[PDB]
Amino acid sequence: VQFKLVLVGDGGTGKTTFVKRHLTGEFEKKYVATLGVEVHPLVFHTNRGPIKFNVWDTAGQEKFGGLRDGYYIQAQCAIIMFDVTSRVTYKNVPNWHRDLVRVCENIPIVLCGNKVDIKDRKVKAKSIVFHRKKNLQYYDISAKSNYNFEKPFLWLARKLIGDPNLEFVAMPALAPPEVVMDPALAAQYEHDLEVAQTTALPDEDDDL
Amino acid sequence: GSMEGILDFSNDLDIALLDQVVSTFYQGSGVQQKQAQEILTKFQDNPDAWQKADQILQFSTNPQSKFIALSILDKLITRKWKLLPNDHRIGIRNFVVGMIISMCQDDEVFKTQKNLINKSDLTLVQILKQEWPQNWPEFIPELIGSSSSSVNVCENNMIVLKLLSEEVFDFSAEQMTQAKALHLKNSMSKEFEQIFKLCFQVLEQGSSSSLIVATLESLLRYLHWIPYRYIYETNILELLSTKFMTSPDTRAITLKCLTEVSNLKIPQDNDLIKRQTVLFFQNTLQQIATSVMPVTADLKATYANANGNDQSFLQDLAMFLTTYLARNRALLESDESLRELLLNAHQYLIQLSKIEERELFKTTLDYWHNLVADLFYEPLKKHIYEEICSQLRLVIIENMVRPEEVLVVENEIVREFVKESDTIQLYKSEREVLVYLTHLNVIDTEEIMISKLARQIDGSEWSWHNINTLSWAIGSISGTMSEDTEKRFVVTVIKDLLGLCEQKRGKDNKAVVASDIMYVVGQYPRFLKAHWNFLRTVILKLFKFMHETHEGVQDMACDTFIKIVQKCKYHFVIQQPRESEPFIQTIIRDIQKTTADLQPQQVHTFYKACGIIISEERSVAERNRLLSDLMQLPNMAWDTIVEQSTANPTLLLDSETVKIIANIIKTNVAVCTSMGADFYPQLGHIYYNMLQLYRAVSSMISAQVAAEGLIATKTPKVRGLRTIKKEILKLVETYISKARNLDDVVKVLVEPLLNAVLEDYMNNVPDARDAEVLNCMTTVVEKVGHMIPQGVILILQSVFECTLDMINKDFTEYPEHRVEFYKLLKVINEKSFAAFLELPPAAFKLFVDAICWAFKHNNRDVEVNGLQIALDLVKNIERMGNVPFANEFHKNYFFIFVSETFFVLTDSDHKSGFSKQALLLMKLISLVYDNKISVPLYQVPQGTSNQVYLSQYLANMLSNAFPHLTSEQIASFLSALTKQCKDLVVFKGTLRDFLVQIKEVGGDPTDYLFA
Amino acid sequence: TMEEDEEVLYKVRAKLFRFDADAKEWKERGTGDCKFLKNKKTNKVRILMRRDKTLKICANHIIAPEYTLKPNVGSDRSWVYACTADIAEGEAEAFTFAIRFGSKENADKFKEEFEKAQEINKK
């Protein structure tokens, strides 16, 4: 039960950061432009069973676009991303949507305005209307604060499985093993732990 | 493995190997997929891969391989078409056309290879953009003719025509020059009469749903631009509003078509077109009532069930009704025979407004605002909609979203974490409509609310949700009623909410009802101002909630306190009847007790609210005495902490001491924020010792960095010490930004400040420099910079070169210094430009470098200020007239600014700054073509006018930067650009035309004559 | 769900990090409720932590007695410690974890409960 999901939008809007947050839980602060596409499997556990997304995270920068719309072939859903702090990225949403629906004529699509954690918002909520005539779902999101970060996948799962009452459920938690530490390298995790002890945790000014 | 073989072009292309790489990419996974991906990209990017295209389309068995082949042709067609020899152009055309014809006539391929045919159609349209109609003025006639030979061909021709209309009318603004867009628009316009014939015939004929849907899809695009007569002088509206609404296959696209028809503004004087506008609406609503759903249907439930395409249809229905009615409902409001149609259409909207779907609700709510705002003003209209508006009152009251102020939520009633701004705008919109609805019938609104309340008292409808949405609605309509009705209204609401407080004893219960009462009371300050006895009781109750163990209620009580004070402060400074003292006196006297259980941030809000009150006292002597009373506790803790810090200056090692100091300063910041210029007496009480503390803390930080390394800056100890410095800077910045006595600022505050902060900033290691120093200095320069010319020079000397060196190695490090740095340069350049004139020539060159460095940022904060500094600097220099410094400036830097501005204009990586870049470039060019540079810009024959040399310089610059342009393109572009340097709109269009042409070969130089 | 045979000895909101020794940086693993679960049958206490909205497991391991909570240089409200067998991502991997809390009082209470649990597992 797997579905191909293509993720498109201007460079720097947070597509790869959003996926990585869902993949590993991390928040990547650095901007390393995606080269063409990166494919990652992503599984959610639902009350209707597991759903697997094959996430095709495409490049937004034209100079790194690779196969461009070739990535959209046989997609079953999509996320269009823009950055509420960059008006140009919302102005390009109709261009990404055009190229996407020319290949994928009848798929569920979520429009996501990312980076709502930033105080100086530029794309006002009242002006976000492109989704209405195009039957896209819309969410404000923040990959940094996790605001609404699950809602695009929850909505897509509901449309793809065909069950509006689908919800995410807690994955079962097997009993963890009882392993004693290794005395052959016990004198070594002094080093790997000292390094970790003296490397400051990021974002110490956050509520958590 | 050997997948890379296809990257070698010495041999012939192994099609079977290619197909394996493609299948590996699309159907594979893991590393093989990743490697195949890179190979395919490299293959596609080979400038000769297009020559392999046709043999891939001939001999490949993989549809994805052929798709990628067409992507290779598209790149060639869109960017290099006119560089091909003419024979290669006809070969590509003939091959693409034949492939399309071949795929249509094979009924099995036409069914299953839809994407590949769509991609080929788009590829053909790319050829049309280059070749049609000048080099193919029979394409449309042949397309029309060939539509009769086959149904599959006719259907596919509708797809080609749809894509052509899109590329010409919908997406041409960014992709073509003005001249080419006009050419293709006129060309389609001239041949549309025939296109419409084929379209209307197919629709009237009526083959099967496949060809109809494709024809309607193309019609949707035409409606964006075609003349009105094609829609009203034919029978097409009857077909759309009846025939094609009945079949669900065509209903979705037809509704979108009728929505586009609806949004035009009709010739508002011809009765016939009005009757036709009424008629297709009447037909459409009748088809919905009989074929889809009656007006009584439960659309909320239907949407929730989400069968088939129901959700999309209801979205499209909402868009159709709101679009049409916002434009044309007046056509239905006078004729009594149309009253039922008008009200039935609005009843469908009522039902649509009950759907649980935020974005759909916002769409209908937008329409309702349009309606009620019109009924608020238009004579004799609101009575028509009385029943509609009554239902709408119920819908909105029962679907109010949680306002910002309500900090308690259920997940178990707990405390908010995040600011829901998707919900902020929604609440504002709901409030706006409900306010209008209350004005339209205040009796109906009160009766709904009072009755719903009466059934909360009974527990007959009690729930979290029902009391919350009702309370939020009640608070949101504040200001709609007259003071007298409001009086009686609020009394009734409070009395009954209090009754509900005692009834529901749960701790979750009591928290829900407390938040609702706090919200309501905070929303009716007019009532509070008139009933002091109640206001006093409310405030004392809030003080008791400041000892609540429920953190949500506690936080909300502090916010409600300041929210009430902001509006009612005057009633806290005066002595009320029956009162022994102004209430501000009572608050201050027990402030330690009141705030004992609050977190520090909340204590600061409490002090800020007191400062609001104190600033209402205009008797200076009494105000200052209130201020000193308010600051008693922090000033005593301050006096203790500084006497104990001067003697043995090591007690600041104590983390507990650092926390105490930071909170003292944060308290001063809070009171200064609300008191502004009135805060000066308190600032003078601590200023000297505070700057001495600033120096003492700074020595500690430096000592820790030296003893522990840079990592010390991450430690809780050093972070707490820097918080002290940051808050001191914030306090000074806050006061100076609101100061009214600038003489005292300059004579008392500035010199000790600069002595304390500047050298410390300059002589710290980069990772220990506080960007807040820059922010503080920006405010100093902004407010008194004109009075401290030598102080501004001192700021530059201390922060300019060392901060520049922090930020000029990449675009990412020290992001806060980056932003503050250019805000500081901006204000210095606009208010104390003389400070840059005194700079040494080497430093002034760094200044120019720093400005152009800002250009290349993608960070909008930095980029915008950089372009503004450059523009203000050019103006600053121009204002000097014909003097050596200005002449030397132009000689050294004019062409640097021109070339650097051109670079960011054309590199496709700074699109967001186009407008400001264009403005800067137009200013620079206008300087030369107004002879406002009084010195030759060159080092070329003598006597040459600067206008001639600028053209030569730019022609040579562009020839070398864009060598694929012809000399005539560059000359035509510059000719148009220089002539238009007094008309920003036309100037910008010419720049946009250039940015199009540099992306292809063979652009027409006459395009620059468009204006 | 596989947790109803267990008793919640302690629960606290936390943010969990894992140390990427290669990149020499801490990486967030998840934010949510950190629970100390005692198995009613075996009396063994484990840490189980789930992400807020997806409810995905980001920590699942015994609170072994050989572990020691250490401070991080940049925080007074976090603990670092080495874990040898965590099955949140499936196969029992070894991790260097850091866990941060909303307040120093939370972090200190956590250490108290973490050590009490170690005594229980010491049986």
Ligand SMILES: Nc1nc2c(ncn2[C@@H]2O[C@H](COP(=O)(O)OP(=O)(O)NP(=O)(O)O)[C@@H](O)[C@H]2O)c(=O)[nH]1
């Ligand atoms: N403040 C904030 N920054 C975010 C957020 N999401 C992503 N970013 C930041 O935006 C920048 C871009 O990162 P990235 O995820 O690679 O964007 P992208 O669209 O995938 N880039 P490309 O399309 O060129 O491959 C990063 O610095 C990232 O930290 C967010 O929600 N909030």
Ligand SMILES: *[C@@H](CC(=O)NNc1cnccn1)n1cnc(-c2cc(C(F)(F)F)cc(C(F)(F)F)c2)n1
């Ligand atoms: C009802 C109950 C109450 O007074 N305090 N709560 C509890 C909780 N647990 C046990 C016992 N009592 N209640 C709730 N809120 C109010 C109330 C609030 C306010 C406010 F505006 F400040 F929020 C004002 C007033 C008023 F009207 F001024 F008295 C009452 N009462």
Ligand SMILES: [Mg+2]
């Ligand atoms: Mg990316």
